[PDB]
Amino acid sequence: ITQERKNQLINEFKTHESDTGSPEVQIAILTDSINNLNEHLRTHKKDHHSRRGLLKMVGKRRNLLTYLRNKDVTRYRELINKLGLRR
RNA sequence: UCUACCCAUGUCCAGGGUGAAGUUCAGGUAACACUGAAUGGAGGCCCGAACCCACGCACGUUGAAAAGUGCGGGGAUGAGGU
RNA sequence: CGGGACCUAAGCCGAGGCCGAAAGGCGUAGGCGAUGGACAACAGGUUGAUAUUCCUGUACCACCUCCUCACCAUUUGAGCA
RNA sequence: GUUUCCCAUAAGGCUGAGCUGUGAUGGCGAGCGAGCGAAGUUCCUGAUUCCACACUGCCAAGAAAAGCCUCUA
RNA sequence: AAGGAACUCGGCAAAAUGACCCCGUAACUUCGGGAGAAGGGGUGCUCUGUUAGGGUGCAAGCCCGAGAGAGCCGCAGUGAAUAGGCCCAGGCGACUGUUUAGCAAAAACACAGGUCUCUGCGAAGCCGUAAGGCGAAGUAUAGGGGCUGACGCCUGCCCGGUG
RNA sequence: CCUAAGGUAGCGAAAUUCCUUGUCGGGUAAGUUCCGACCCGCACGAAAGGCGCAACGAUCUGGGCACUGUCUCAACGAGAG
RNA sequence: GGAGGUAUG
RNA sequence: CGCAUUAGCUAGUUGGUGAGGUAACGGCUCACCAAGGCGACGAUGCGUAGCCGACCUGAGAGGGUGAUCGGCCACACUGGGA
RNA sequence: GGGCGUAAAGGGCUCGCAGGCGGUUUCUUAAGUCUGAUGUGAAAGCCCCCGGCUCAACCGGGGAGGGUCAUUGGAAACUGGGGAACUUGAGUGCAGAAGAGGAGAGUGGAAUUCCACGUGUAGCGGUGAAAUGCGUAGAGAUGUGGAGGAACACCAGUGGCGAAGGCGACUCUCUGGUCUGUAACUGACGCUGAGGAGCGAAAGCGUGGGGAGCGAACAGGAUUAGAUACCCUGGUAGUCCACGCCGUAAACGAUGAGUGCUAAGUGUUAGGGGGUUUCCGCCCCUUAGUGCUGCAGCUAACGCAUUAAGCACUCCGCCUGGGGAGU
RNA sequence: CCGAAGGUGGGACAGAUGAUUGGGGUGAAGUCGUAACAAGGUAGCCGUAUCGGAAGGUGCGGCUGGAUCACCUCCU
Ligand SMILES: [Mg+2]
Ligand SMILES: [Mg+2]
Ligand SMILES: [Mg+2]
Ligand SMILES: [Mg+2]
Ligand SMILES: [Mg+2]
Ligand SMILES: [Mg+2]
Ligand SMILES: [Mg+2]
Ligand SMILES: [Mg+2]
Ligand SMILES: [Mg+2]
Ligand SMILES: [Mg+2]
Ligand SMILES: [Mg+2]
Ligand SMILES: [Mg+2]
Ligand SMILES: [Mg+2]
Ligand SMILES: [Mg+2]
Ligand SMILES: [Mg+2]
Ligand SMILES: [Mg+2]
């Protein structure tokens, strides 16, 4: 994940000017990493070590989504639409 | 001009059943896998006429016939019949 | 209509040619050779005996010009091929 | 035949079973009696025939030559 | 009739089963099968009824058409004809196929698969005296020959003799 | 002691076992056949393959059910001689 | 001065 | 109470409408509708057992027993029926 | 009211659904929790106190006692539910650091073997001693070049990285994680985790490649009473590669994961800050790993000891004498 | 209509028995070797594969729960 792409994501999803810690922001960064990493694994199918990194990312994302849904259901629903998640 | 194989070019195989691969959809997953439906229409596939074959029995045995007839039988999209 | 004055497959024959005691065997060009390709007519009527064949009606194909009309062109000149 | 550019998702074409008109002021026609002669439509069903090896799929990878069209010599 | 394989080398022959619909279906398996396993049930006609629904058509009207309920008749309703008998277990061959035209259809041949071996291309091999051919308009992932015969697990020892 | 080396796995009274209807178990009232074991393999054996094996078979073999003129045991009727 | 590694009865 | 070397079970099953039936509510039964109900907080299945007051044991928590006496339940050769 | 370093006992390792457990302040609620009253827990029996059988057993009278019980009030510290805050846990941003972490594609040098050639001659090889074996058909030794496969000397270090298995030539592509500082942001979002999913040395298996060295099996020479072994000369599978399967190890630290607390000394790895400075460096401090020694404490002992086997709390796994049997 | 028993059929479950067969346990003195315990005389053990009368041998990988002697670090 390049730095300019990351700046796009954080600005697009941040809840306010200085916000970088919000669930929304974190889930956006993770979602790109997860998608980006999936593409790498499609070619390097046997890279089991890297894949373990993906599994932690997937767990982190689920926990942030679970937190958001329980905190404020509205915010949660908006985010999964913008990101196109099935959750 | 029988018959064996081959070569070239034709032609024949009523009907019914089963439902391969592939594909689509739905569910499912982080993704895949996986699951269920539908579509699809494979096969020296199944059942069964024509056609080809000839397993059993009876009869015929100076025969209707120098190899047949009757009742059943086997294959019947194939290495098929002609 | 089916076959020949059309085409070719398998195969057969084969000018020269190659090979072989002889007889002959093989084979190039070129031919032959349907079971295939190409190809213009249908309905009705009729005899004791034939019928897309004869008769009635209406067609179609190829070719020919004593003729008629239309158009084009006569040496980069139509047209045929 | 091949290559590069330009248009277009339409144009055009090549085909095509059949259907309608005409052929037909004709023929045929139950039947009547060589001759005479009515109605002669629609609906349903429907091919193993045709469009057509068209489409789809498959592997075992599915004649030739002439007719025919064209190109110059 | 009664019996029901007591017949016989042997259930030979005959009998029995047979169509459609519904329920249901084992061991085992190469997961496809076995399987129509097996074992049962229903079936006629009449009225609800040009039915629920479907095809065709502008509509009438034509066809197709389950399922039920309610009745009626007979010994019996695929009322006739045509239409698998089934199950258990073992031997052999895996299989479809082929074979002694006219006494043998099989366990025999073939087979996909396995392996060995020859063959560098004018290939080896084969036909012919030769030319000329097949191989092959192919080229070692190809072609010829020997043996084995799907698939699964395997395929031991001996090179003295013969090749 | 001999040989080149002395048969392994698996299977075995077998399409192979003469003795033999081997012995044992099952199936029958009674089973020289059949099935399951055993192993003294007359004379199995690993590509003239060994041992298994679903599916297949007008194959060979044994047992059940249905069914019956096959039979006990024959009778009647039809047609053709 | 101590740890770790490099034949019968 | 035991067993997961028992994980899915259920189809009057789970609700609704109506009717019937009962001393009486109720799928208790039927007809017609919908697809629901139970289950890892152990359904289902298998095995085992009458339950309890109490009795034996133990410092107690517990463990074992459920004879005699009392309460409740179930049964009367086996199955069903009124 | 027990344990799991060595006595039986920590899953090979990670990810993770359900479940269990959960930081600080305040308000609220009253499910858990505590409490008042009321109701109920038959008789016999057990216990306490009386009385009658000549005593005792036994019999009788009066009480006591007994529940995660129900109805109805109250309290609000803790647990649970709801709301609002907080930042330490956890994570994000921003700035740095190291690393055999992984996958893919290339490249390089040494050495073994083989092939060709020059020089060159009688042994070479091997053992405890020999022989089998190779060599006059020119071996071994030696020089040049070439082919091919596998592994990466020195660096290299109780050094690094990874969850574990494991990872060590160089270059490039893709890619995971950890550590340090910062306080810019979210504000408990966390821990563990049966079942489940993924990974998991070596051997082994299937298909197809590749095959130098090594080498189960096997052959031969020795050794030996025998030698189906050790030793020697050969040598097949395998070791290697792609895909798939297998899912086991003394998979070990024989030590589950998370968190916090509890003397020091001393190496070493990657950072940060500072102290005299151009620096170098020395010294000081600080994190996070990795070793040794060693208090308190623990242990049957051996030993562990801020990397606990100490003191605690949460969750998971597992043990209950040895064989039979991991059948 | 409902309906016990009974009948037919194919499965499920549980037990008993069975030719024959496989290891296992236990036994006063059997036979063959000697695998382990010391460096057990080839260190042992673990997983796996293969081989062998038998313990066992060998290969690949792993462990120290390995003896003896050399060398590099750590600690006293
Ligand atoms: Mg067929
Ligand atoms: Mg047939
Ligand atoms: Mg004929
Ligand atoms: Mg012709
Ligand atoms: Mg008899
Ligand atoms: Mg008799
Ligand atoms: Mg018969
Ligand atoms: Mg056969
Ligand atoms: Mg056949
Ligand atoms: Mg014959
Ligand atoms: Mg015959
Ligand atoms: Mg044969
Ligand atoms: Mg052999
Ligand atoms: Mg033989
Ligand atoms: Mg042989
Ligand atoms: Mg054979």
Swiss-Prot record:
<keyword id="KW-0699">rRNA-binding</keyword>
<dbReference type="GO" id="GO:0003735">
    <property type="term" value="F:structural constituent of ribosome"/>
</dbReference>
<feature type="region of interest" description="Disordered">
    <location>
        <begin position="1"/>
        <end position="22"/>
    </location>
</feature>
<keyword id="KW-0687">Ribonucleoprotein</keyword>
<dbReference type="InterPro" id="IPR000589">
    <property type="entry name" value="Ribosomal_uS15"/>
</dbReference>
<dbReference type="GO" id="GO:0006412">
    <property type="term" value="P:translation"/>
</dbReference>
<keyword id="KW-0689">Ribosomal protein</keyword>
<dbReference type="Pfam" id="PF00312">
    <property type="entry name" value="Ribosomal_S15"/>
</dbReference>
<dbReference type="InterPro" id="IPR009068">
    <property type="entry name" value="uS15_NS1_RNA-bd_sf"/>
</dbReference>
<comment type="subunit">
    <text>Part of the 30S ribosomal subunit. Forms a bridge to the 50S subunit in the 70S ribosome, contacting the 23S rRNA.</text>
</comment>
<feature type="compositionally biased region" description="Basic and acidic residues">
    <location>
        <begin position="1"/>
        <end position="19"/>
    </location>
</feature>
<protein>
    <recommendedName>
        <fullName>Small ribosomal subunit protein uS15</fullName>
    </recommendedName>
</protein>
<comment type="function">
    <text>Forms an intersubunit bridge (bridge B4) with the 23S rRNA of the 50S subunit in the ribosome.</text>
</comment>
<dbReference type="GO" id="GO:0019843">
    <property type="term" value="F:rRNA binding"/>
</dbReference>
<comment type="function">
    <text>One of the primary rRNA binding proteins, it binds directly to 16S rRNA where it helps nucleate assembly of the platform of the 30S subunit by binding and bridging several RNA helices of the 16S rRNA.</text>
</comment>
<keyword id="KW-0694">RNA-binding</keyword>
<dbReference type="GO" id="GO:0022627">
    <property type="term" value="C:cytosolic small ribosomal subunit"/>
</dbReference>
<dbReference type="InterPro" id="IPR005290">
    <property type="entry name" value="Ribosomal_uS15_bac-type"/>
</dbReference>
<comment type="similarity">
    <text>Belongs to the universal ribosomal protein uS15 family.</text>
</comment>
